[PDB]
Amino acid sequence: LKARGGPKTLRRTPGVEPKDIRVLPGPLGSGNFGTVFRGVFKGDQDVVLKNAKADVMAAEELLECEMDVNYHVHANAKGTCARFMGCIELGAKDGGEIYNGTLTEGLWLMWANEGENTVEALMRRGTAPLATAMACADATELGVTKKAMRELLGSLARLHECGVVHRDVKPANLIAAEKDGGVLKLIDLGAAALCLPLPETLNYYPGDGPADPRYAKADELYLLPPGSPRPTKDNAAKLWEAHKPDRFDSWSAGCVMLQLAVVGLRTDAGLERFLADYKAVGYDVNAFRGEKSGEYGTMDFAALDANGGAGWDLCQRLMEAERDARASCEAALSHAFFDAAALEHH
Amino acid sequence: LKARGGPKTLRRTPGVEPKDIRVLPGPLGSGNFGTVFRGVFKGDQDVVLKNAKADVMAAEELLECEMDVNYHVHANAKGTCARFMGCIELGAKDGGEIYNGTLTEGLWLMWANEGENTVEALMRRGTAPLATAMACADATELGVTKKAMRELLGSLARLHECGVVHRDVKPANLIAAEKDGGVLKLIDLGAAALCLPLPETLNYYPGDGPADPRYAKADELYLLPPGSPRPTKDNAAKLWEAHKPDRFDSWSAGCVMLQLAVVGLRTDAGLERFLADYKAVGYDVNAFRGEKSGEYGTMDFAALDANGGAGWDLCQRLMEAERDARASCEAALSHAFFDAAALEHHHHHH
Numbered sequence A: 001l002k003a004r005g006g007p008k009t010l011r012r013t014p015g016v017e018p019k020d021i022r023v024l025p026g027p028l029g030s031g032n033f034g035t036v037f038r039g040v041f042k043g044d045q046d047v048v049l050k051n052a053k054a055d056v057m058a059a060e061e062l063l064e065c066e067m068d069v070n071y072h073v074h075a076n077a078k079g080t081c082a083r084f085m086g087c088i089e090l091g092a093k094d095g096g097e098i099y100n101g102t103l104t105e106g107l108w109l110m111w112a113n114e115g116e117n118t119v120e121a122l123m124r125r126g127t128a129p130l131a132t133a134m135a136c137a138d139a140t141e142l143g144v145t146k147k148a149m150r151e152l153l154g155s156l157a158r159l160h161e162c163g164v165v166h167r168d169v170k171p172a173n174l175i176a177a178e179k180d181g182g183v184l185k186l187i188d189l190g191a192a193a194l195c196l197p198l199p200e201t202l203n204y205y206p207g208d209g210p211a212d213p214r215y216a217k218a219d220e221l222y223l224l225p226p227g228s229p230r231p232t233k234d235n236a237a238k239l240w241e242a243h244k245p246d247r248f249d250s251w252s253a254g255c256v257m258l259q260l261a262v263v264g265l266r267t268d269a270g271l272e273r274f275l276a277d278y279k280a281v282g283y284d285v286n287a288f289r290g291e292k293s294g295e296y297g298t299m300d301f302a303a304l305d306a307n308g309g310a311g312w313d314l315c316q317r318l319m320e321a322e323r324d325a326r327a328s329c330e331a332a333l334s335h336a337f338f339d340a341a342a343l344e345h346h
Numbered sequence B: 001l002k003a004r005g006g007p008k009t010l011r012r013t014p015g016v017e018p019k020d021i022r023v024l025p026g027p028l029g030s031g032n033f034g035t036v037f038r039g040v041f042k043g044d045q046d047v048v049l050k051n052a053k054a055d056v057m058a059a060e061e062l063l064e065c066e067m068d069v070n071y072h073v074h075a076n077a078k079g080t081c082a083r084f085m086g087c088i089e090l091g092a093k094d095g096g097e098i099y100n101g102t103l104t105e106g107l108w109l110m111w112a113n114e115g116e117n118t119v120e121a122l123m124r125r126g127t128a129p130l131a132t133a134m135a136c137a138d139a140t141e142l143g144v145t146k147k148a149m150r151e152l153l154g155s156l157a158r159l160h161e162c163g164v165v166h167r168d169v170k171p172a173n174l175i176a177a178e179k180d181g182g183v184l185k186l187i188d189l190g191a192a193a194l195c196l197p198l199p200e201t202l203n204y205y206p207g208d209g210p211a212d213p214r215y216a217k218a219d220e221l222y223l224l225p226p227g228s229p230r231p232t233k234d235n236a237a238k239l240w241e242a243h244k245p246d247r248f249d250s251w252s253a254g255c256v257m258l259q260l261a262v263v264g265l266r267t268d269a270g271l272e273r274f275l276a277d278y279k280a281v282g283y284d285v286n287a288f289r290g291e292k293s294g295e296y297g298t299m300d301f302a303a304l305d306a307n308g309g310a311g312w313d314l315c316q317r318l319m320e321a322e323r324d325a326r327a328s329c330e331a332a333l334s335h336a337f338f339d340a341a342a343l344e345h346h347h348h349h350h
């Protein structure tokens, strides 16, 4: 007597069939657990596709969580991130080959291709191509920083409002979306947490988690401190207020601001140098300006100095050593840095 | 008063200067914590170059450990792995651009390019191309399995002998080295542990470390089990005997053998299907043959069946459910699977 076989259950999005998708060879990148490819959907829609790495422990489960968070964001924070177009799951015999333009076995996620750039790529080419991609009329460090940060903080505020902490905020995960007026959109919710029970928290736990060492505060690589109780539907709100996991994104946003504002900080080594000095002076911006900035003769901090040092003050708020002192992204959005020019004389 | 500052310090290998290295754009591969590129050294030496991923926590520390282990292996187990040519560290102003063909800021490792094809790539094209690249005269599944497993198990035995567990054994990390008669060499010591105090253990810790879930036993994703005194210079030798972390490599080598031996098992899907059934029948090879083999009518187990089922038995030894029952790579080497047949080659022998 043999065990019977049975159907395979596959996840699918209404309107999206495997036949509809052509994948383009050559990954745009590989992250911790997955690989991203360019694709064409229904003949003329430019999309991007992500699958799980076969060689990485738990990769499918990590992608499943990214999928869940993407659905949450699609429902609650439209426009903050790349437009989510759903999923497609394929079986063994029904899978093809990447180098032949067909989706291979396993779960795939799909988004609109929001643009061929990232802010990291653009800023490293220069403030000018960055401002052009952003449709930013004030093509200066100050101009791009004001526009970019208003957009990033606005989006982070909306994410946090619906319980999502992105946890991988950085220029490489921002695209200037030319089809939507150049507005910045976040990508990559692969490390994101849902910190409210809707119906349950996702990817949210005590202790250290995935982080980009350049953009996460070195002694604060957690959303919940290692001693914290595990989150439950009953304690989530208390934990949100107590441990302020959203302040993880605040620090990262401060790092983004530093790089947009100061050309010399756009390289990894540049920002790394600044942060080491910043830590050395006790996470005190005024201390850095007084004791350290003289050492940065090759750089220009004009965007941060402008208007009573408003840029520096906003960085200080986003980058306080203590979470309890660090500004929320929502609060930061109301900072003087973002004030409209008075008496413009049009 | 003003702080004086001072010079930068960069790590370098005698005889290897960044001006002599041209990097070719286009990552050969993206691993967990690093990126590999082809390069040309001194205008005519084909090399491979690896740096850390900027976006991965402690990728820096992992590349340093990979460096340390490569030095250990170069000193103690020459020929087992891709030839290690040392490191090159570049600073900020002297750092270049991959698109301009120059090494970027940070630490780089360099190895000889041992060949353009991995065993994974070859075996998937066919036993024929694989046998050719291996200089394997017996161009059958049995032939290539015998030659390849002899080489692999030999190298693993040597690595274990100097305290190194590779921890990422699979066809993708084997290259048939054209410039050394086609012999297999391991690549990628990025997950490797040095498990003895020589003078200090490296990348050796209790609990689940990194692992390719295809080539690691699903419930044995560790070298040392969460339950065991952290590795120290004093207990190292004891843990080795108690927890047998090298048996991690034994299981992986059994997986390689299965794939070399059975064409149908060369796809992820194929090997996955087998290991699931194998697991289902209690990690019992004979049970598999008895209860399941009939369901594999599309596959041909001849290489494992040959000579009283020697191949199947070696697979059983390498792939015992319990580490205490699982063969070491050294023990696996003397198995009957590797015996010359009676009067083998008699027709041309002098």
Ligand SMILES: Nc1ncnc2c1ncn2[C@@H]1O[C@H](COP(=O)(O)OP(=O)(O)NP(=O)(O)O)[C@@H](O)[C@H]1O
Pocket: A028, A029, A030, A031, A032, A033, A034, A035, A036, A048, A082, A083, A111, A112, A113, A114, A115, A116, A117, A118, A172, A173, A175, A187, A188, A189
């Ligand atoms: N919606 C999108 N539109 C355009 N490009 C995208 C989109 N999503 C991702 N990309 C690009 O694909 C690559 C990786 O995307 P991401 O979602 O960050 O996954 P990843 O695993 O982190 N890959 P990588 O950035 O190379 O480490 C980057 O080049 C992104 O710019």
Ligand SMILES: Nc1ncnc2c1ncn2[C@@H]1O[C@H](COP(=O)(O)OP(=O)(O)NP(=O)(O)O)[C@@H](O)[C@H]1O
Pocket: B028, B029, B030, B031, B032, B033, B034, B035, B036, B048, B082, B083, B111, B112, B113, B114, B115, B116, B117, B118, B173, B175, B187, B188, B189, B190
């Ligand atoms: N010494 C070598 N000679 C030739 N090819 C090599 C060598 N080392 C690595 N490669 C190739 O580079 C790619 C990755 O190398 P590896 O050392 O495994 O680092 P990795 O970060 O794990 N990249 P990958 O294994 O592809 O995910 C593989 O395609 C190998 O074929």
Ligand SMILES: [Mg+2]
Pocket: A031, A172, A173, A187, A188
């Ligand atoms: Mg990313």
Ligand SMILES: [Mg+2]
Pocket: A268, A269, B054, B105, B106
């Ligand atoms: Mg770096």
Ligand SMILES: [Mg+2]
Pocket: B031, B172, B173, B187, B188
């Ligand atoms: Mg590898």
